[PDB]
Design a protein around this nucleic acid. Structure first.
Lengths: 141, 75, 66, 144, 142, 62, 185, 57, 100
RNA sequence: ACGAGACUCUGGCAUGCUAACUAGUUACGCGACCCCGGUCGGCGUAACUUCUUAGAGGGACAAGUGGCGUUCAGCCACCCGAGAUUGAGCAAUAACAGGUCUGUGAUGCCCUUAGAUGUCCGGGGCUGCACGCGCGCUACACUGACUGGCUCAGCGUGUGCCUACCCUACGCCGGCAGGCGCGGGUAACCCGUUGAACCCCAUUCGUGAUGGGGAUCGGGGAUUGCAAUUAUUC
């Protein structure tokens, strides 16, 4: 048996996003295909069902350290703000795009409001996340 | 100067010269083909996945910055 | 540029002309004699001075120094 | 597929402006003034057209389906904060202006600020920086 | 039985990797995830230096857990290298003969001295009048 | 004209206007008897060998 | 394996250095075999400590040039890695052997200097540094503003320099320095 | 205390305190030979000694 | 009973002799003592131009004030404390007794 | 006698010493999950100080060896070792019509002192644009840009005597800037395990002033402020 840490997160994020295709229970907003994920971005994501990929990434990011609030994910998904003629700086990601995905994974129970604020994933939300790591660990065998 | 007007899509003349000539080159990169067939790099990149699907080229190493192919087994 | 100043050389000759018997030849023990027979304010001087008296021994058994 | 199709349009004369066909569809529309690399993607996402094709393989029966979204973005569920002309000063209608209206709507507001003799309008009449830049050291090229 | 645990640190520029040996089987993982699956994956053989030059059997009866903190990416990789190599030789001196330990350290120092001794290089302080520790601002005449 | 191999025997001193060249007492690996002086560029140790494009040029002693 | 070392997959053995003048300044064999050409460094501490650096590392360091690429060794190690199978899939020879043949055939023997300029021969180490120099700036001139990636232009030049194809940027610069030196001599 | 300022700010404050005494006393007790002060801490009591040449003056 | 005593001081040894002075009176009372907890020191950096005006080569200063802080907590009632607190205290050291 | 050096601080080495419920490790006992074991910044304890913090010490001296040198001062090389030149602060005699009276309740002299060169208020200006020069920032791309994914820092600072003004977690609303609630932190406690970029992995582009570059400029939306037009910033 394997947990998620012995599997490469590169092929582990979109493996869990494939599990979010069979569900289709994610309560996706409608402004999804017309939004720019951060003020420091300039284009919308190329792959259109990006909502299913990052909601998969916020899930595993809650696995390794819980209690993270929407302010923390704006730091997770931040990056260089290429300021044009002025020097670039780090800038946080968008809040609403992060506020919806954790509201979405509370829609279909995979995560709950931790005490002291924040969001930690329920024990059943950790049971199935190894079922995705077990099949890819079996995929390399 | 002299602006390169590469080809964005194959006409059947070049497409003929692809399914025949390139699988015999010792090195297949989207660069070495795009400079020899006078086509863009995206079409060159796109023109090596089917040859990998048809199995007429061998993928030796692909990377974000560099994707390399060669001939098949000679035997 | 490891050249000893006079205050290292001056103090190194005074102990040898006064404690020629208690100090030895190896650096470490006559390092330990120096803090007892001379109050040195720093540790580097304690090693700088002790470093020279050791050098003067293998000049003494080879003959007299002026 | 990678072989070249039939029914080509190397130059799709759209909105009285040429548009290259060798370019990808998401970026060929940017050749039109009033639509940039951002506003072009939401349109090609409003009309479910696949962005993996160049602008010279898409069927012409739906290129106007793209155009009607350019002219009419409101009923196609496009937000107000995407429009290059929000809350017009005359009609206050949230509209997107496209490459011929763009430049004529560009010398209306310029001449409107001149007849009222606004300072911001006179700075355009004289050929100076209007957003309050230091003109002492920069801006020399057109100025002989 | 006996708790043959050795907790050996390895430093780098700022990255500090402290390994934790014990009498287990041959598993080695830093921060819980295995050794070979560590980014950047360009430094793969770098963390395999102690395992390649010494063979797998030297780690067969020793398991290591490494916690790292500080520094940058490659600093952590270079810290983990001379953290688990220092931990293994520190295992073979507390519990078994040095006759084997002296014959395994010479394999490492002959390969690269950094597997055992830390590099005492740190970022020098910036001095005013310039953008760096040595570089100055462009002096202009007239 | 043949090229020859020359093994340095002792470094003499630095020369050149900017002190860029090095004078060396170099000896021919082909026959140790015939030995020459020769100006060289770049850093030179003691015991490394050179590739003279001609042997008959002797560098003036500084 | 305490017995053999492969540069990722390239065997360090059976690499002959024909030119005797440089087999003392080319760390390639039998104690300098490494899996990665990325090491801690310190080779620039004393004067001649640069000689015992593996050349593949010295090829890797001289690639981080021209501003933007400064301090990006993780990118150049990927470059020289990729270049090594490219030459192997374009020559069939051993990558290490081809690199050795190139720096031999690209290091100038003579060089003029201001002492009116006098022609003097170069030291072996300077010759090696100049060799790695020429075939690195050459590939930089080829990949610039060109669809051909930095990996291939690096690959072919040390292929063309290994045989002195006289269309290498290194060789055209090497004989030119040896022609000017042949003039004022 | 009332507003409870931090440890960094308090140590800076008494430095400003000792400074303003020295200047005030240097401008007033100089002709009587003022030569510096020193404060000694005590709960609810701060005694300050004026080291002066002519103590009767 | 669990009381905390804070010792903050600008000078190090004048703190060290007080941080060891409270220990002389506490083992005098033969009760369980907490070891002096060395807190990370705080340094106050102030860099300014040496020049009153803006002329000459640009040179700066490095005014610092490294502050030190030690913690010792004791399991003792209040009257055993306030007899020890009043013994041999130097002005350079500031004591903070926390009853809770 | 001063200056140099010494000295002060800093950097690196001490599984030795002193200590830690505002720092942790390691075990134990539960909890979660996957097939005895594995993972957890999930939860509480007993030992310990490797990791953290900072005190006291120790440590390096050209000390050893081999050459060179009057064999003196020393130099080179090597062995051993964490170092066989870390970095900075301090810094003499004499001097400059160097700068500063726009730092000062440091100041001589001179000028002004009520219709004021005093003080305060309103508005403007210090930014004004044929041109020249100095310090810089962003770039000219493919060793790249774009979009995802992944994964690591260390310096600091933070609620004000006058002072009316802090740093922010978490939860909601909004594309965004931001707004509305609730709490923490006078701080090794909370921000905060400071999930920083670069880099790394994977798409798209394809040598085209191109998805290089982002100057100029239009329209709209916020925030600070008594007040933003000559666009405060966003």
């Amino acid at each position: 048996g394997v947990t998620v840490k012995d599997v490469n997160q590169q092929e582990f994020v979109r493996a869990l996003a494939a599990f979010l295709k069979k569900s289709g229970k994610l309560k996706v907003p409608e402004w999804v295909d017309t939004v720019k994920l951060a003020k420091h971005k300039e284009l919308a994501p190329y792959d259109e069902n990006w909502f299913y990929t990052r909601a998969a990434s916020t899930a595993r990011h809650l696995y390794l350290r819980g209690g993270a609030g929407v302010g923390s994910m704006t730091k997770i998904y931040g990056g260089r703000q290429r300021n044009g003629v002025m020097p670039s700086h780090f800038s946080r990601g968008s809040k609403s795009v992060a506020r919806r995905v954790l509201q979405a994974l509370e829609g279909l129970k995979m995560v709950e409001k931790d005490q002291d604020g924040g969001r930690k994933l329920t024990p059943q939300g950790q049971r199935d996340l190894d079922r995705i790591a077990g099949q890819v660990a079996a995929a390399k065998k | 100067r002299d602006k390169l007007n590469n080809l964005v899509l194959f006409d059947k003349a070049t497409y003929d010269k692809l399914c025949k000539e390139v699988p015999n080159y010792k090195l297949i990169t989207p660069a070495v083909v795009s400079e020899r067939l006078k086509i863009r790099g995206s079409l060159a990149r796109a023109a090596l996945q089917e040859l990998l699907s048809k199995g007429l080229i061998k993928l030796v190493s692909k990377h974000r910055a560099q994707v390399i192919y060669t001939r098949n087994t000679k035997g | 540029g490891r050249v000893r100043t006079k205050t290292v050389k001056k103090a190194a000759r005074v102990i040898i002309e006064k404690y020629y018997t208690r100090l030895g030849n190896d650096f470490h023990t006559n390092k330990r004699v120096c803090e007892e027979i001379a109050i040195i304010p720093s540790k580097k001087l304690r090693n700088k001075i002790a470093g020279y008296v050791t050098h003067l021994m293998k000049r003494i058994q080879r003959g007299p120094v002026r | 597929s990678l072989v070249i199709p039939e029914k080509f349009q190397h130059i799709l004369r759209v909105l009285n402006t040429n548009i290259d066909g060798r370019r990808k569809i998401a970026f060929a529309i940017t050749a039109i003034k009033g639509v940039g690399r951002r506003y072009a993607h939401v349109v090609l996402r409003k009309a479910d057209i696949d962005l993996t094709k160049r602008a010279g393989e898409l069927t012409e029966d739906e290129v106007e389906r793209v155009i009607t979204i350019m002219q009419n973005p409101r009923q196609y569920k496009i937000p107000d904060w995407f429009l290059n002309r929000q809350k017009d000063v005359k009609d206050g209608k949230y509209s997107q202006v496209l490459a011929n209206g763009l430049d004529n709507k560009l010398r209306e507001d310029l001449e409107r600020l001149k007849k009222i003799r606004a300072h911001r309008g006179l700075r355009h009449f004289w050929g100076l920086r209007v957003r309050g830049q230091h003109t002492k050291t920069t801006g020399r090229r057109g100025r002989t | 039985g006996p708790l043959q645990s050795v907790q050996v640190f390895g430093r780098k520029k700022t990255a500090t990797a402290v390994a934790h040996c014990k009498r287990g089987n041959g598993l080695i993982k830093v921060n819980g995830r295995p050794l070979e699956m560590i980014e950047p994956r360009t430094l793969q053989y770098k963390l395999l230096e102690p395992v390649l030059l010494l063979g797998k059997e030297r780690f067969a009866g020793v398991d290591i857990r490494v916690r790292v903190k500080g520094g940058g990416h490659v600093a952590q990789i270079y810290a983990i290298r001379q953290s688990i190599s220092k931990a293994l030789v520190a295992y073979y001196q507390k519990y078994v003969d040095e006759a084997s330990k002296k014959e395994i350290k010479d394999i490492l120092i002959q390969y690269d001295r950094t597997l055992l001794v830390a590099d005492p290089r740190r970022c020098e302080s910036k001095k005013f009048g310039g953008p760096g520790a040595r570089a100055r601002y462009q002096k202009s005449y007239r | 004209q043949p090229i020859k191999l020359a093994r340095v025997t002792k470094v003499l001193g630095r020369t050149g206007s900017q002190g860029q060249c090095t004078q060396v007492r170099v000896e021919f690996m082909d026959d140790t008897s015939r030995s020459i002086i020769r100006n060289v560029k770049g850093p030179v140790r003691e015991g490394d060998v050179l590739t003279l494009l001609e042997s008959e040029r002797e560098a003036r002693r500084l | 394996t305490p017995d053999i070392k492969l540069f990722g997959k390239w065997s360090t053995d059976d690499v002959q250095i024909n030119d005797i003048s440089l087999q003392d300044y080319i760390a390639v064999k039998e104690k300098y075999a490494k899996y990665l050409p990325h090491s801690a460094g310190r080779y620039a501490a004393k004067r001649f400590r640069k000689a015992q650096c593996p050349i593949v590392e010295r090829l890797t360091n001289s690639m981080m040039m021209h501003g933007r690429n400064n301090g990006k060794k993780l990118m150049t190690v990927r470059i020289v890695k990729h270049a090594f199978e490219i030459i192997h899939l374009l020559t069939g020879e051993n990558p290490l052997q081809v690199l050795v043949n190139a720096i031999i055939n690209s290091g100038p023997r003579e060089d003029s200097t201001r002492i009116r300029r006098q022609a003097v021969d170069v030291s072996p180490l300077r010759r090696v540094n100049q060799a790695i120099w020429l075939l690195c700036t050459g590939a930089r001139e080829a990949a610039f503003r060109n669809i051909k990636t930095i990996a291939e232009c690096l690959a072919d030049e040390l292929i063309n320099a290994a045989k002195g194809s006289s269309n290498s940027y290194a060789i055209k610069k090497k004989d030119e320095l040896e022609r000017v030196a042949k003039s004022n001599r | 205390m009332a507003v409870q300022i931090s440890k960094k700010r308090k140590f800076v404050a008494d430095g400003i305190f000792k400074a303003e005494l020295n200047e005030f006393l240097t401008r007033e007790l100089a002709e009587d030979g003022y030569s510096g002060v020193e404060v000694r801490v005590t709960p609810t009591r701060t005694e300050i000694i004026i080291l002066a040449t002519r103590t009767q003056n | 009973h669990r009381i905390r005593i804070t010792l903050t001081s600008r000078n190090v040894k004048s703190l060290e002799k007080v941080c060891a002075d409270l220990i002389r009176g506490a083992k005098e009372k033969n009760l369980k003592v907490k070891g002096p907890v060395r807190m990370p020191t705080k340094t106050l950096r102030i860099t300014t131009r040496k020049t009153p005006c803006g002329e000459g080569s640009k040179t700066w200063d490095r005014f610092q004030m490294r502050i030190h802080k030690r913690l010792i907590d004791l399991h003792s009632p209040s009257e055993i404390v306030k007899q020890i607190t009043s013994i041999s205290i130097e002005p350079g050291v500031e004591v903070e007794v926390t009853i809770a």
